[PDB]
Amino acid sequence: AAQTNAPWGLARISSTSPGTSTYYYDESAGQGSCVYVIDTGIEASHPEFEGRAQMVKTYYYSSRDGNGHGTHCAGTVGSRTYGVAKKTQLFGVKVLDDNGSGQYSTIIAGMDFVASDKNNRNCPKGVVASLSLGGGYSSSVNSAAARLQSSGVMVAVAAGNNNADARNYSPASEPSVCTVGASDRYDRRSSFSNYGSVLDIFGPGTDILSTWIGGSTRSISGTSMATPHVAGLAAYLMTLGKTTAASACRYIADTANKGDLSNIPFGTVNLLAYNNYQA
Ligand SMILES: O=C(O)[C@H]1O[C@H](O[C@@H]2[C@H](O)[C@@H](O)[C@@H](O)O[C@@H]2C(=O)O)[C@H](O)[C@@H](O)[C@H]1O
Ligand SMILES: [Ca+2]
Ligand SMILES: [Ca+2]
């Protein structure tokens, strides 16, 4: 399949070169997989989700995304126009309030929630969790992320936006999950993207168009935007049978475009997510 005039990031993850605008992907499109977006919620009613999104958990008075961030991230995972895995099932878990804030205890509960809740969902092709959030190092937060991964979920987490070594942030610094940095349309590390040995992969993170609340769309930037590219990519590859939850981060690094990014500090991987789709 081919989607013309796609967002640059979708084109990029199906291209060996920057500078193109068509997204190429197997039409299976993540069908039969599930992605949990652990964030501020998801506006499930947005036309772009086509009934494939639903809220399954909130820790606040409402399950509504009153912020926009969670909806944007979900849109990059799985919206029809702006998504990597256009047929995946999206589940929203609202661990962040409408200002984008949340206590680590709530975040940890949300992670253990997905580990259990997947047993209530139909996801024959596998389960992914996308965590576009973080804070200072916390072994408990890292442990929670490692549990979720161990339970059979491909956990993708944002590196952080401090232009610093991600070793000092959580859950970014957990070795067993997939830590995702951000790049821009010219194959530069995004200037805010964390880096370090703990990074596994980069994805598009600067000027990413996706869904927003009120049935709208907008373009924003962050490792929060790169992360769902990778999450959607995992779901897509899992549906195709190329990899599994336990192995998907390794597989994505193995099959990445290598050596193509600029401003990658010595000791950080130079790997850009790529779907290896050959029409
Ligand atoms: O069971 C334990 O406590 C032992 O493994 C632990 O790891 C946690 C899970 O058991 C494991 O499946 C995955 O989720 O990693 C978890 C974590 O990092 O906390 C710990 O390593 C120790 O508690 C160990 O005794
Ligand atoms: Ca720095
Ligand atoms: Ca890792």
Q: Is the dihedral of CA 153, 85, 158, 14 positive or negative?
A: positive
Region of 245 please: left (phi>0), alpha (psi -120 to 50) or beta.
alpha
Nearest by Cα to 157 from 117, 111, 116: 111
Residues with beta carbon inside 6 Å of ligand 1? 143, 146-147, 150
Instruction: For residue 142, give the ligand 1 atom closest to its CA.
Output: 18
Neighbours of ion ligand 3 (CB under 5 A): 200
Find the ligand nearest to 265 CA: 2
* Whether the bond into 18 is cis, omega within 30 of 0: no
Ligand 1 centroid – CA 274 distance (Å): 31
Torsion sign over Cα 203, 206, 207, 212: positive
Count of helices and strands (H, E) across the chain: 6, 15
C-alpha count within 13 angstroms, C-beta hemisphere, residue 240:
19
Q: Sort 27 into a burial class: Cβ within 10 Å, 0-12 / 13-18 / 19+.
A: exposed
DSSP strand pairing (216-220 vs 257-258): unpaired
Annotated binding site for Ca(2+): 16, 175, 177, 200, 260
Decide if 197 contacts 220 (C-beta within 8 A): no
Domain residue ranges of the chain, discontinuous segments joined by +: 1-279
**Pair 168, 158: CB distance under 8 Å:** no
- Nearest-angstrom CA–CA distance, 12 and 31: 22
Q: In whole angstroms, what is the distance from residue 102 CA to residue 107 CA? A: 7
| Cβ–Cβ under 8 Å, residues 77 and 90 | yes
Does 224 participate in catalysis according to the annotation? yes
- Count Cβ atoms below 10 Å from residue 140 Cβ, excluding itself: 12
| DSSP, residue by residue, 52-112 | -EEEEEESSS--S-SSSHHHHHHHHHH-TTT-SSTT-EEEEEE-S-TTS---HHHHHHHHH
* Euclidean distance between CA atoms 159 and 175, whole angstroms: 12
Q: In what order do the strands lie in the sheet with 257-258?
A: 53-58, 89-94, 33-39, 126-131, 153-158, 178-183, 201-204, 271-272, 257-258
Half-sphere exposure of 124 (CA within 13 A, CB side): 3
CB atoms within 10 A of CB 116: 10
Q: Would you call 63 a catalytic residue per the annotation?
A: no
- Do the beta carbons of residue 4 and residue 264 sit within 8 Å? no
- Tokens at residue 91, please? 């589940």
Q: Please, which residues have CB within 8 angstroms of residue 186's CB and are 6 or more apart in sequence?
A: 18, 262
Rg of the chain, C-alpha, whole Å:
16
- Residue of 39, 98, 165, 184 with catalytic role: 39
Closest atom of ligand 1 to 148 CA is: 14
**How many angstroms separate the CA atoms of 17 and 40, rounded?**
33
Instruction: Reply yes or no on whether 39 is catalytic.
Output: yes
The answer to whether 179 and 218 are in contact (CB under 8 A) is: no
Residue nearest to atom 18 of ligand 1 (CA): 143
Helix or strand or coil: residue 179? strand
The architecture of the domain spanning 1-279 is: 3-Layer(aba) Sandwich (3.40)
